[PDB]
Homo-oligomer: 69 residues x 5
């Protein structure tokens, strides 16, 4: 799956349908994988660089793949 | 959904019916989403600014949407 | 529900029936709410003041309500 | 249940059958309680003293009771 | 089960099929055990040494056993 954005997590958002949004770089993206919610908030709190990989690389696009560095 | 309050979490409370209350700004609000309990206590501990979005923007009102910054 | 004890958590204990005991002030109290285990150990680690509310305010009494400050 | 060992946790191990081993003092002990995995790793990271109570107080013995201080 | 690699976690990756990859030493390995995701990210954040044990000790090999030190 191609790299879409790499950077520090700017903010996260819990959504009404239980999906989770993250803003990294210039994109707001969401995931429906519940296991990623605490992992991404941890990455946000500790200032980790993340790379999100998705073919839906546009604002509001979905993803499931993330690299934590 | 409109912004209701933005600020640091002043306290949280676990309730007898397993919902979770947070006090942000001048409002006490609750959520029935279990996944948000550890996320909100983490935001409280680390001093994150949160924005809660809800149409029930009054003391005792419910919410599911939260932005963590 | 009335306030029973307020203070820093002295110790916590996982029990054989999967309930969780906490010692705050002069009371040892337990809860059967699984969601509260990680929250209470976080409060213990970070030195938060907690208030436990319960009508069974005696050693070995049960509770479900907790305020984290 | 009697005290078996007290001390800082030296290491933990996730096992192939999803049980979790801890080494405290001179004993390696395991638990089948999933809820204890994150609690014990937190105790390890923060240097907490733990007391494990079990009647199977020997290397490879099972436990469910733990006091976190 | 034999030791395969020991070292600090270089990066972790959440995968599209909900497995989790870790790079330790010269190997990229994955696990299908959901409970290990938060444990491994905690080990990564805090700089813990981990040892992964697996008979599939090659890039892309699976594991379930991990020692955290
Ligand atoms: O978390 C939501 C969702 O994330 C992942 O899917 C993403 C989009 O939601 C999904 O529409 C997108 O599908 C692609 C196909 O991968 C591609 O082969 C096809 O040509 O175009 C569609 C539309 O762009 O894929 C992205 C991730 O690449 C995840 O796969 C999915 O299960 C779900 O978790
Ligand atoms: O966590 C509890 C609850 O939070 C969210 O719902 C909130 C209130 O509980 C709910 O009564 C409120 O209803 C709104 C309608 O959505 C809106 O269309 C109408 O105009 O006004 C009523 C009353 O304010 O909605 C808020 C959220 O804005 C969440 O949606 C719900 O599922 C549940 O989690
Ligand atoms: O986690 C265990 C338990 O905690 C909460 O209940 C507590 C006691 O376990 C319960 O026996 C006690 O019951 C009270 C009633 O609240 C009171 O109205 C009646 O007059 O006397 C009885 C006996 O003391 O209540 C406390 C909490 O105040 C929690 O409510 C319960 O669901 C369970 O989680
Ligand atoms: O996590 C595994 C297991 O831990 C607890 O049980 C422990 C041993 O696994 C179990 O074999 C042992 O049994 C005791 C009897 O309870 C006792 O009555 C008899 O005298 O001796 C045997 C052998 O030592 O008990 C220990 C705990 O003391 C936990 O109870 C069990 O449910 C399970 O979680
Ligand atoms: O998380 C994925 C997976 O990890 C563990 O299995 C690993 C490989 O996925 C599995 O193919 C491998 O099988 C071994 C046999 O157990 C062994 O008897 C034989 O000699 O070699 C094969 C191939 O290496 O085992 C490793 C772990 O050593 C875990 O056991 C499995 O349930 C699953 O979680
Ligand atoms: O305590 C060390 C070992 O724990 C686990 O095995 C225990 C127990 O020791 C053993 O006798 C029993 O057959 O299985 C238990 C787990 O269900 C691990 O599986 C071992 O690798 C040791 O770490």
């Amino acid at each position: 799956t191609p790299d879409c954005v790499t950077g520090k997590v700017e903010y996260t958002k819990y959504n009404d349908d239980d999906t989770f949004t993250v803003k990294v770089g210039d994109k707001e993206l969401f995931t429906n994988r519940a296991n990623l919610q605490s992992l991404l908030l941890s990455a946000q709190i500790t200032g980790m660089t993340v790379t999100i990989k998705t073919n839906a690389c546009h604002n509001g696009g979905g993803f499931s793949e993330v690299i934590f560095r």
